[PDB]
């Protein structure tokens, strides 16, 4: 089996700044981490998110370290990643990019990553960023078209494997959406959908079927009384301990009956981490389908919403739900 | 005869309306006064007839009879007040109905009526908006919009519809997505449009619906329920509507994501209809609706069940057209890319199996659609395999795709010019017309090649639509001068004068006019017209269209460039023609200190007359009115053509003067007055019994005109020639009343004489005449208000004793009501002998015993007069301070207080039974006698017959009377007196009982004092109340502390308690008051959290700050000073955490500091500042989540409010401030209103102070209320020299670049270096910025107007006060009004001045900044002459000024903290009171010397303004402003 | 170190 490596948490989120892209007046001021940034000022909204995108990692396993960049620039991601390779070989190296209070990326890599007060700095190429970390990785890009990025990132895997013949392909990419669909701008929803479904399961799954369900079949019970539910994440004796349960096991059932053996066990098998990604990937896909949107992993996998087991989950939520008025 | 005639009317037919119309007036001429009884209905029936007059059978009889009734049956100025329309209703017609058959009748019927008093009238009755706010990028746009909506919003839109819709969707298209911030103003109309239009308009309007939903996409989800309701109204399988229909449904879909799941199951219902009852040629329309079917995606997850049946049946009946059915396969087929249909596959096998065999036609598509269900399927299709290979071997069936497919899952493996060019034809232009069409030519011009789209896009809309090209006259000028060259707009300018100087066009003036008001708002400036900007043409044009605001705008203009005195002539002829009197003194100043027959006719009339009217022109209103003189050769048929004829005269000069407003209407409304009078004086011989009812109605009508003596002298003159002064003294007596200064002196004496037959100016000693004992009373007052006071006391004396023998003479029954009028006549001798005696004598004690007996004696001979009973009380007052005043200044400095007590009590005792009555018989203004009855109560109230006296006066006055001085009634609860103890808990206990909001504030605030009386007796009180009503109290007592705790919050204390003890630590070394600083905060941390913040406070900080408690235990057990440097790293370690913090916290969540509040719904208590018992009660319903905190040196925040009536209330919450000092400064502003208020020349100028609320929670604590939009001065003046690139600094650098070491300068160097600073810099920015946020020049004048006067009272109120330091921060102004607002009373009195560092020396704020933004004259004019008139009201009502500062200043709550300020307080009490006084009576320059008003407010001014005050004036408080 | 522990 192989182990991790400490997390590369870099986000860019310009708290205050619409990006020249957007034009927004719905009141979708929406939540990151689950914290609204707009009622503290700049410094601790942005501290306050990096800390809680922290515990959201520290919760599914312990860390060696994470580092975090709240900020740019471009000299700061040059020395976190050789810090990370020095602290390397063959363990993976996980990356974090959100984006959201930048321009929609490009076949470059386009990035607001400067020392700046509002600078139209640099088109930050993915080929410099696979130079920089040439070891095993894992990539998570949160953005407006990552699929963009993830085509990109293959074609200049085969540039580099066209000059070689004169770590790529041993790294794994999830994408929010194909890179020619938008994330939904939707009142209730937080604006991190996609790090949410990959790092807090639950709480999305439970207020989803919440908001979503066409017709309750328990009467009384809203989003006041699940946000109060008591239990804890590691006691099955509890009604939290018990949905992560059902849903762990719900879960790796799928991925059991669809996928091939050697994707599975390379998958849900060889690591913690991925097998954890990759469970809460299948949420992510069938949560953001309703959407228009289609969730996009650099091994394709067969489509999984379809499954019948899915109706299990929501029976069982049901009656979870039923207890607590 | 009437009721039947009444009857008919109010249901009658034009011929019957007519008739019995005629029939009433002629009767009303016949019936009189006992008629009154069906007037007051039979004028409003009349009224509602002549107001619809296109409806009214020849509306010139319903005129007619209701000036004979209001003539015939005795109405007075009354009328209007009962139907306050009538005189409009006149006016109305007189203008519009353009028929003079009655507008002269009802110019008969305003005379008729009697000219009403303009403040009796008054009584009982966009462009510029924001150009200066937006870059024009922004602006072009907004305004056409609006033009756009004015046509839309109207009906003439059923007319014009189409165009007007075209213009705005092309509007959106042009601005991409910043169009969006327009949904607000279009939606809620467009869809209501839609709701009324005919179906040809409804198909267009849901097109261009569609198209708006498109260009907006998702911002429509707002609106997503209302065009959802129309589209099921209307979709009435009307094959076009059909269509149209489904289009707005593709495009709705597109433009939202998967929201449309929530609007889609309300549309299935229809769509189901469409697939059964088709009947359109190839059912082409159920084939449009599959298209649609086909973009819903993962939109039908949940609704395949229900559309798939009918989808089926189109491509399983043989009968049905082919594109039909291929459609519905083709259909099926994409489905399957987005939808699992595994649970469907018999249901959709089945259909296609037996396609295959009925037609190779639809095969060929059928076997496509099969194999992607195949696909789709994968291994789940083998159970089918077995069945469909029959028929694909029975027919020919060939098809690589499924054949490949099949095979693989059987084996197991998967798959501008012209603007110019025809402006120039203003040279050829000669008539008005010609210069009509030339302004709309050009108009149109200009928008067709506008640069803008969104104005070359209502082109097509301007060649009609008139009103629209005017309006977007001047948007367009602008746009299309910004892109000319010199040469062009050369060209332009001469046209533009060429078009002003042709001739008086008043469209083309006004328009022109406008437009160079523009240009002097924009960025462009002004027009170069010729030189200087043409402000010499401009205003003359003003000066001809009545335009006077911009007329004296342009001539002050021409005032700045130098002083001419032809320019201080037309100054004083525009201020005439504004009627402000005001300020044409003071230019008649500034000149005077800079610079070295009708009448005939009218003279005779008052006395040659036959000439004198013969020669005033005969086709003048004048010569008329001097013709009709018929009037004294009773030439009455001549009066009455003569009238006939001025009333036509007059007709057309109320034209030329209809609509300035009533002040002018006024004069014209005398004029109709005199000619309806002449009619009267005519009739009056010519007339029965109502010849004396004219009399009475004479009288009454003066009652409701002006106080105007020469317009009472022209009616007099009229009246005369049939009623001598002898037959109503009443008129002529008020007459020489209402006269003032040199007028009364000479009419006055002119009238008595007149009156009396008797000349009593000679021989000045004979004995006053017996003749109308009014007459001489009126005579002894002139004398009075002279040089005489000593000869009017005497003659008054004589008079009183000739009175007493006429009522001794009067005894008897008919003369009975004269002995009555003769003891209302001594009672007012006697008060005036009172008034009298002491002006001339003083007060002596050889005085009072005379005074009082006059007093005595006028209130035995009247006894409802409650003034006599005021003097009495009021007397008797003086009369114990009097004694006390003369033992503290002779025999004292105690058996001398015992020998006073002897008298005083005998005093005193009819002075509280006086006060009382003198209560009792008033109402309102009882303020001033409830004071001086609190006074004598807590300071005599101990003995035993002022406690009797006391007992029986309080049980006889109604209680609501005490409300106003709950705030005093309460401070002196700690009294140790027990009779007045035990009477004021009485007292309260009764007023909580019927009044409980007016004390549950004062009160449980009252409950948290430290000192334990106040403790127990509130809470005694506060039981009491609980026995009538636990809830108020529970909940006044759980708001009031959690509001209070929200206040301040932890980390502020712990801030300010750290710093306090670092400057005790390292500066004083005072390591007991280290401690003492601290204590405190840690016991207070001993209670534990108790709320969110608490919580995580405690968390942060609860370690350190423990540990820091254990190394000061240490230090204090072993005396080692470094403990104390350990706890003090501890501290300043949490210091500095938290001054990191604080600036970043800009709001407060409820649910995080006060849970409790944020669940109160339905409160039972009133809204702070609310109450009010006469009104119902507004509750407290809401309480806004979250509060909006303030970032300044304090850190107050806004708390939001919503109250039952379902209106907002906003509050600043603020601690660290003592606010019961504002409270009573509040009280007293209300008192000088209502003074001002009662004074009718200050009532005219509508002088008063502005108020806001105050409600203090603790000592350090409570609520100010929220002001309307106003702003601070500073901001004002930053914004303005930022937005101008001015240096803020400027004053100040210029005087640190002379003087570097300035604040050490000798005074008169540095008098020297600040004047010379003043004068490099044109220090009159507030001007500028009142005229640039003007939206017109006469919203500008009455801003300035407004502003100066405003100034002026505060100036006199303060300076009274002895209001302290005043800077730029604490001054306000109204943006609407331009009036001021002062908002920091803590230097309530001249503490200001004696403070040890930087003492001030100005009465008030008056510098160079404010005196340049009045008129241009200066500070003469209104200024100083407001400064008059409010100083001589502060100077006459000195007892009630006096009652209420007493009582502030004799209170230990607030004294004490004034006593801190200065010092005993017994005395300097008594100092403050003194030098209030001196203000107050003219002593304050002089103790020996008295001073008159004028001289007063000179010295003030000289004051304020001198520069060797304000050279020693702190920067704080920048003098140089 | 497995890709899943737990206690039952
Ligand atoms: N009744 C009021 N209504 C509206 N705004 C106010 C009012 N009072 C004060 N302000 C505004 O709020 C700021 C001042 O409020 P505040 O903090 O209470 O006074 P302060 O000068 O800072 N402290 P102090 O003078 O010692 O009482 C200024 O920006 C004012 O424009
Ligand atoms: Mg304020
Ligand atoms: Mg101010």
Same mark, same amino acid.
């Not at chain 1, 990109?152 to 790529?168: D, G, N, T």
């Not at chain 2, 005017?470 to 602008?478: C, E, T």
């Not at chain 2, 970043?1144 to 018992?1173: I, N």
């Given at each position: ?15 205050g ?47 060696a ?17 050789t ?10 190296? !996980? ?38 970390? *040439? ?20 074609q ?5 494997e ?88 719900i ?65 069982? $939520? ?5 207890? !607590?008025? | ?15 019957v ?45 319903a ?25 409009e ?43 200066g ?32 819709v ?12 910043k ?29 261009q ?35 149209? %229909? ?13 929201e449309?799941?929530?609007?889609? +199951? ?11 009852h ?5 059912? %082409? ?26 989808? $089926? ?69 083998? %159970?089918?395999?077995?069945?469909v290979?029959?028929?694909? $071997? ?47 030519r ?12 969104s104005?070359?896009?209502? =082109? &097509? ?26 040469d ?11 078009? !002003? ?6 469209e083309?003036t ?5 437009? &160079? ?25 003003? &000066? ?24 201080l ?18 230019v ?30 005969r ?41 300035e ?81 040199? *007028?009364?002196?000479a ?20 004995? !006053? +005449? ?26 008054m ?9 006429? &009522? ?54 009247? /006894? ?41 009590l ?20 009882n ?5 001086? $009855? ?6 005599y ?12 006066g ?9 409300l106003?001085?709950? +705030? ?28 409980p909001?007016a ?48 206040a301040?919050?932890?980390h502020?204390? =712990? ?40 919580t ?14 254990? =190394? ?23 210091? /500095? ?7 970043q916290?800009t ?15 339905d ?33 107050? /925040? ?50 008063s ?10 000592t ?51 008098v ?13 920015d ?38 302290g ?59 100083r ?48 009171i003194?030098?209030?006084r ?44 | 170190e ?7």
């Amino acid at each position: 089996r192989m182990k991790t490596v400490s997390v590369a948490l870099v986000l860019c989120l310009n708290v205050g700044v619409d990006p020249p892209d957007v034009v927004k007046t719905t009141p979708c001021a929406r939540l990151e981490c689950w914290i609204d940034p707009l009622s503290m000022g700049p410094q601790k909204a942005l501290e306050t998110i990096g800390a809680n995108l922290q515990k959201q990692y520290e919760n599914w396993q312990p860390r060696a370290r994470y580092k975090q960049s709240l900020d740019p620039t471009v000299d700061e991601v040059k020395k976190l990643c050789t810090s990370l390779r020095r602290n390397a070989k063959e363990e993976r190296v !996980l990356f974090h990019y959100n984006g959201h209070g930048v321009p929609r990326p490009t076949v470059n890599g386009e990035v607001w990553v400067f020392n700046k007060n509002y600078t139209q700095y640099i088109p930050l190429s993915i080929y410099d960023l696979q130079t920089w970390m *040439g070891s095993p990785s894992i990539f998570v890009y949160d953005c407006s078209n990552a699929g963009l990025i993830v085509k990109s990132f293959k074609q200049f895997a085969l540039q580099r494997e066209q000059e070689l013949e004169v770590s790529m392909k041993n790294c794994i990419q999830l994408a929010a959406c194909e890179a020619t669909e938008l994330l939904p701008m939707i009142p209730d929803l937080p604006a991190d959908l996609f790090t949410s479904c990959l790092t807090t399961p639950i709480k999305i799954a439970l207020r989803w079927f919440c908001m979503q369900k066409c017709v309750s079949l328990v009467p009384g019970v809203t989003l006041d009384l699940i946000e109060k539910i008591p239990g804890r994440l590691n006691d099955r004796r509890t009604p939290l301990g018990e949905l992560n349960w059902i849903f762990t096991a719900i879960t790796d059932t799928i991925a059991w009956n669809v996928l091939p053996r050697d994707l599975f066990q390379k998958l849900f098998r060889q690591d913690l981490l991925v097998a954890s990604l990759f469970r809460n990937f299948l949420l992510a896909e069938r949560i953001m389908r309703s959407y228009n949107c289609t969730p996009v992993s650099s091994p394709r996998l067969p489509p999984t919403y379809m499954h019948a087991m899915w109706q299990a989950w929501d029976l069982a $939520v049901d009656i979870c739900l039923s207890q !607590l008025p | 005869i009437l009721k039947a005639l009444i009857l008919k009317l109010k249901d009658p037919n034009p011929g019957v309306i007519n008739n019995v119309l005629a029939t009433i007036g002629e009767l009303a001429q016949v019936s009189g006064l006992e008629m009154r009884k069906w007037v007051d209905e039979l004028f409003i029936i009349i009224m509602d007839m002549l107001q619809d007059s296109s409806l009214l059978a020849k509306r010139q009889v319903a005129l007619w009879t209701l000036g004979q009734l209001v003539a015939s049956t005795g109405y007075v100025v009354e009328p209007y007040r009962k139907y306050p329309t009538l005189l409009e209703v006149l006016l109305n017609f007189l203008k519009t109905e353009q028929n003079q058959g009655t507008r002269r009748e009802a110019i008969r019927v305003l005379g008729l009526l009697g000219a009403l008093d303009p403040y009796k009238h008054k009584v009982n009755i966009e462009m510029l908006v924001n150009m200066g706010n937006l870059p024009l990028d922004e602006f072009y746009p907004a305004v056409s919009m609006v033009a756009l909506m004015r046509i839309f919003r109207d009906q003439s839109l059923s007319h014009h519809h189409t165009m007007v819709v075209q213009a705005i969707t092309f509007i959106f298209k042009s601005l991409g997505l910043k169009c969006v911030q327009f949904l607000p103003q279009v939606m809620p109309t467009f869809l209501n449009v839609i709701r009324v239009c005919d179906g040809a308009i409804r198909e267009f309007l849901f097109q261009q619906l569609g198209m708006l939903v498109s260009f907006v996409k998702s911002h429509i989800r707002p609106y997503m329920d209302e065009i959802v309701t129309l589209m099921r109204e209307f979709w009435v399988m009307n094959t076009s509507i059909q269509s149209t %229909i489904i289009l707005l449904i593709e495009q709705i879909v597109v433009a939202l994501g998967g929201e449309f799941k929530l609007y889609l +199951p309300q549309l299935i219902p229809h769509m189901l209809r469409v697939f059964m009852h088709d009947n359109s040629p190839g059912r %082409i329309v159920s084939i449009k609706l599959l298209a649609a079917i086909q973009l819903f995606g993962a939109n039908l997850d949940d609704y395949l069940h229900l559309l798939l049946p009918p989808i $089926v049946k189109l491509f399983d009946a043989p009968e049905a057209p082919l594109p039909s059915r291929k459609a519905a396969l083709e259909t099926v087929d994409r489905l399957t890319e987005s939808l699992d249909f595994t649970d469907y596959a018999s249901r959709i096998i089945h259909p296609i199996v037996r396609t295959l065999d009925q037609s190779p036609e639809l095969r060929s598509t059928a076997m496509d659609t099969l194999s992607s269900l195949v696909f789709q399927l994968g291994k789940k299709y083998q %159970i089918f395999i077995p069945m469909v290979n029959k028929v694909l $071997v029975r027919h020919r069936i060939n098809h690589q795709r499924y054949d490949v497919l099949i095979c693989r899952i059987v084996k197991g493996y998967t798959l501008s010019t012209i603007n110019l060019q025809k402006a120039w034809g203003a040279a050829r232009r000669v008539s008005k017309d010609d210069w009509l069409e030339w302004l709309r030519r050009l108009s149109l011009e200009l928008l067709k090649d506008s640069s803008s789209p969104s104005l070359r896009s209502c =082109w &097509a809309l301007a060649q009609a639509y008139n009103p629209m090209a005017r309006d977007l006259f001047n948007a367009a000028f602008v746009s299309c001068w910004s892109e000319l060259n010199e040469d062009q707009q050369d060209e332009l300018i001469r046209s533009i004068e060429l078009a !002003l100087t042709s001739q008086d066009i008043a469209e083309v003036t006004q328009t022109l006019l406008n437009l &160079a008001e523009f240009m002097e708002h924009s960025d462009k400036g002004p027009l170069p017209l010729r030189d200087d900007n043409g402000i010499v043409l401009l205003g003359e044009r003003a &000066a001809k269209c009545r335009a006077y605001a911009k007329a004296l705008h342009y001539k002050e203009l021409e005032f700045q460039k130098g002083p001419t005195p032809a320019i201080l002539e037309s100054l004083i002829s525009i201020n005439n023609k504004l009627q402000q009197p005001e300020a044409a003194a003071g230019v008649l100043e500034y000149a005077m200190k800079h610079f070295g027959a009708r009448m005939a006719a009218a003279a005779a009339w008052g006395l040659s007359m036959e000439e004198y009217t013969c020669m005033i022109p005969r086709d003048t209103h004048d010569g008329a009115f001097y013709r009709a003189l018929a009037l004294h050769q009773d030439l009455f048929s001549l009066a009455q053509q003569c009238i006939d004829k001025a009333r036509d005269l007059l007709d057309a000069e109320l034209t030329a003067m209809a609509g300035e407003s009533y002040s002018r209407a006024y004069g014209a409304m005398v004029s109709c007055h005199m000619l309806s009078e002449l009619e009267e004086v005519i009739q009056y011989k010519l007339v029965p019994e109502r010849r004396e009812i004219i009399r009475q109605i004479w009288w009454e009508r003066l009652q409701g005109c002006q106080r105007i003596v020469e317009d009472w002298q022209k009616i007099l003159m009229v009246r005369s020639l049939v009623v001598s002064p002898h037959e109503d003294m009443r008129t002529w007596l008020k007459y020489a009343s209402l006269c003032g200064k040199s *007028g009364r002196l000479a009419l006055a004496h002119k009238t008595l004489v007149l009156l009396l037959g008797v000349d009593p100016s000679r021989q000045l000693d004979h004995p !006053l +005449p017996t003749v109308h004992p009014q007459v001489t009373y009126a005579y002894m007052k002139n004398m009075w208000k002279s040089a005489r006071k000593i000869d009017a006391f005497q003659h008054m004396q004589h008079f009183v004793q000739t009175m007493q023998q006429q &009522a001794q003479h009067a005894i008897a029954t008919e003369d009975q009501q004269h002995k009555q009028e003769l003891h209302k006549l001594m009672a007012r001798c006697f008060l005036k002998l009172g008034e009298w005696q002491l002006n001339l004598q003083g007060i002596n004690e050889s005085t009072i015993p005379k005074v009082l007996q006059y007093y005595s004696a006028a209130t035995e001979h009247d /006894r409802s007069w409650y003034k006599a009973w005021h003097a009495w009380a009021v007397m008797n007052f003086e009369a114990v301070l009097h004694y006390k005043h003369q033992n503290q200044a002779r025999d004292e400095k105690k058996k001398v207080t015992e020998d006073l007590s002897k008298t005083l009590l005998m005093y005193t005792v009819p002075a509280v039974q006086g006060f009382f009555r003198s209560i009792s018989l008033s109402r309102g203004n009882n303020l001033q006698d409830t004071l001086r $009855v609190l006074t004598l109560w807590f300071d005599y109230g101990h003995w035993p017959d002022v406690n009797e006296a006391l007992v029986e006066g309080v049980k006889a006055i109604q209680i609501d009377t005490w409300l106003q001085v709950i +705030p005093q009634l309460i401070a002196r609860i700690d009294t140790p007196r027990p009779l007045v103890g035990r009477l004021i808990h009485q007292l309260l206990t009764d007023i909580g009982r019927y009044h409980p909001q007016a004390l549950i504030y004062p009160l449980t605030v009252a409950s948290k004092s430290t000192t334990t009386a106040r403790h127990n007796a509130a809470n005694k009180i506060l039981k009491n109340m609980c026995e009538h009503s636990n809830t108020l109290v529970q909940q006044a007592m759980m708001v009031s502390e959690e509001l209070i705790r929200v206040a301040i919050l932890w980390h502020e204390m =712990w801030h300010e308690g750290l710093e306090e003890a670092s400057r005790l630590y390292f500066g004083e070394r005072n390591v007991k008051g280290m401690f003492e600083v601290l204590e405190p905060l840690h016991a207070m941390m001993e209670r534990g959290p108790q709320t969110l913040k608490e919580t995580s406070f405690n968390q942060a900080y609860g370690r350190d700050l423990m540990e820091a408690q254990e =190394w000061c235990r240490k230090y204090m057990k072993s005396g080692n000073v470094k403990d104390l440097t350990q706890a003090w790293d501890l501290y300043y370690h949490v210091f /500095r955490r938290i001054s990191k913090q604080l600036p970043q916290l800009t709001s407060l969540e409820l649910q995080y500091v006060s849970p409790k509040l944020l669940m109160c719904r339905d409160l039972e208590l009133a809204v702070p500042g609310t109450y009010d018992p006469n009104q119902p009660i507004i509750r407290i319903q809401s309480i806004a989540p979250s509060l909006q905190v303030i970032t300044s040196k304090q850190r107050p /925040r806004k708390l939001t409010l919503m109250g039952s009536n379902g209106h907002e209330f906003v509050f600043l919450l603020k601690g660290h401030e003592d606010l019961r000092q504002d409270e009573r400064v509040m009280q007293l502003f209300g008192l000088v209103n209502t003074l001002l208020a009662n004074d009718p020349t200050s009532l005219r100028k509508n002088l008063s102070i502005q108020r806001y609320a105050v409600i203090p929670l603790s000592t350090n604590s409570g609520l100010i209320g929220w002001v309307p939009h106003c702003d601070t001065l500073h901001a004002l003046i930053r914004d303005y020299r930022e937005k101008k690139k001015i240096l803020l600094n400027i004053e100040h650098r210029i005087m640190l670049r002379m003087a570097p070491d300035y604040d050490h300068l000798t005074l008169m160097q540095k008098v020297e270096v600040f004047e010379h600073a003043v004068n490099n810099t044109a220090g009159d920015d507030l001007a500028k910025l009142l005229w640039l946020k003007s939206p017109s020049s006469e919203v500008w004048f009455d801003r300035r107007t407004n502003y100066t006067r405003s100034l002026a009272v505060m100036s006199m109120v303060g300076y009274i006060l002895g209001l302290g330091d005043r800077h730029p921060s604490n001054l306000m102004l109204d943006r609407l009004s331009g009036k001021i607002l002062h908002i920091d009373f803590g230097d309530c009195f001249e503490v200001a001045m004696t403070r040890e560092k930087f003492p001030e020396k100005i009465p008030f704020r008056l510098t160079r900044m404010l005196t340049n933004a009045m008129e241009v004259t200066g500070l003469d004019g209104n200024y100083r002459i407001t400064c008059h008139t409010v100083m001589e009201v502060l100077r006459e009502h000195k007892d009630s000024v006096m009652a209420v500062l007493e009582a502030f200043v004799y209170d230990p709550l607030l004294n004490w903290r004034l006593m801190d300020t200065n010092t005993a307080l017994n005395k300097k009490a008594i100092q403050i009171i003194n030098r209030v006084r001196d203000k107050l009576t003219g002593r304050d320059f002089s103790h020996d010397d008295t001073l008159d008003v004028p001289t007063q407010v000179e010295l003030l001014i000289k004051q304020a303004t001198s520069h060797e005050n304000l050279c020693q004036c702190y920067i704080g408080w920048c003098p140089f402003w | 170190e497995s890709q899943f522990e737990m206690d039952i």
